[PDB]
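Sharing in case it's useful to others searching the archive later.

Someone asked me privately for the predicted structure of Melittin, so I'm posting the question and my answer publicly. Question first, with the sequence:
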Amino acid sequence: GIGAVLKVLTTGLPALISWIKRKRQQ
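And my answer, the predicted structure tokens:
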């Protein structure tokens, strides 16, 4: 999505740490 490029910018915040989080914790 062309317009999603700007959206993902914020979605990457919670998804960034979520990656390492799921690793150890839920």
